[PDB]
Paper text:
The active site hNEIL1 mutant, CΔ100 P2G hNEIL1 (K242), was used to investigate the structural basis of urea excision. Examination of the structure revealed that the urea-modified nucleotide was extruded from the DNA and lodged in the nucleobase binding pocket employed by the glycosylase for substrate recognition and excision. When single bond distance (1.47 Å) restraints between corresponding C and N atoms were provided, the refined structure fitted better into the electron density. The 2Fo-Fc electron density maps indicated the ring-opened deoxyribose configuration of the flipped nucleotide. The urea lesion remained covalently linked to the deoxyribose C1′ atom. The amino group of the flexible loop residue Lys242 was positioned at 3.1 and 3.6 Å from the amine and the imine of the urea moiety, respectively, suggesting the potential for H-bond formation.
Human NEIL1 glycosylase (hNEIL1), a bifunctional glycosylase that belongs to the Fpg/Nei family, initiates BER of a variety of DNA lesions ranging from the diastereomeric cis-5R,6S- and trans-5R,6R-dihydroxy-5,6-dihydrothymidine (thymine glycol, Tg) lesions, common oxidation damage products, to bulkier AFB1-Fapy dG lesions (22–46). This change has been shown to modulate the rates of base excision on a range of substrates, with the unedited form being significantly more efficient in excising Tg lesions than the edited form. hNEIL1 also possesses apurinic/apyrimidinic (AP) lyase activity that catalyzes β-δ elimination, generating a single-nucleotide gap, with both 5′ and 3′ phosphates.
Residue numbers in the entry: 2 to 202, 222 to 244, 252 to 290
The structure:
DNA sequence: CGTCCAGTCTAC
DNA sequence: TAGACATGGACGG
């Protein structure tokens, strides 16, 4: 559920739906507590884009589609297990909680938001979440400036391994990326975030917040194969690696000294 | 076999 | 903040 996976899911949606025409209503599973999507069109296309840990999906009526209406945008958050799949209409995956159906005359497929653990959410409207920082993958320069010009914010009092999960400043970084990034630099997880980032402005911490997830995207791995990602990892859950619980109870994997603020 | 572990969101 | 939110598989005692 991290940046690279949201970004590959956007790629997948755009490639799978490039020729497809969808029709009818947007079908939510009965168990899902997310909002019904009030969009219905006789002929519409689906496109996507990702920003940090959010994915914007746009449902665009084709010319002359009925009823006459503007496009509708939704924003998804994947939680721990969210994903998109394109399947035959009659072979729906289990836990397909939101479904878009191709219209005739093509082979009848379904584009599904699949979410086993049901932690993901979707909203109506295209707005990104207002507090989130810029995307480490696609807004690198804005993201770098938003960290550095704000180092006096209380957020950077926390250990660097906890600050990397703060989506106001590291939108797209999650639990495996913070392990892999700190591991490249041999920076102890529980050194203070402000102290680590002041010692700055050999790629540095903020550069690696971009280049490391970019590597995952280049694998096509964690994609929307699973072994090429398992071999790419150097720290997260790897043998020989230490691990501690941060203050919110998430496991930080690291090697060597845990740092001064370790619990 | 029973336990444990695997990003926001909510409410006290 | 602390626990909730929730399914399934690996891992033990």
């Amino acid at each position: 559920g991290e940046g690279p996976e949201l970004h590959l899911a956007s790629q997948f949606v755009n490639e799978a739906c490039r020729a497809l025409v969808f029709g009818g209503c947007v079908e939510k599973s009965s168990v899902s507590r997310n909002p019904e999507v009030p969009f219905e069109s006789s002929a519409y296309r689906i496109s996507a884009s990702a920003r940090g840990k959010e994915l914007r999906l746009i449902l665009s009526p084709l010319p002359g589609a009925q009823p006459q209406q503007e496009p509708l945008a939704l924003v998804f958050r994947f939680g721990m297990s969210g994903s998109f799949q394109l399947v035959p209409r009659e072979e729906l995956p289990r836990h397909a909680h939101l479904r878009f159906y191709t219209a005739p005359p093509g082979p009848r497929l379904a584009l599904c938001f699949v979410d086993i653990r049901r932690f993901g959410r979707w909203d109506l409207g295209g707005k990104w979440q207002p507090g989130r920082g810029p995307c480490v993958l696609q807004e690198y320069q804005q993201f770098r400036e938003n960290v550095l010009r704000n180092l006096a914010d209380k957020a950077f009092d926390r250990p660097i391994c906890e600050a990397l999960l703060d989506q106001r400043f590291f939108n797209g970084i999650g639990n495996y990326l913070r392990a892999e990034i700190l591991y490249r630099l041999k920076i102890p997880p529980f050194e203070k975030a402000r102290s680590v980032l002041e010692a700055l402005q050999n790629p540095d911490l903020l550069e690696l917040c971009h280049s490391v997830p970019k590597e995952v995207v280049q694998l096509g791995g964690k994609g929307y194969d699973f072994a090429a990602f398992r071999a790419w990892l150097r720290c997260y859950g790897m043998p020989g690696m230490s691990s501690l619980q941060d203050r919110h109870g998430r496991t930080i994997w690291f090697q060597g000294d845990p740092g001064p603020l370790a619990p």
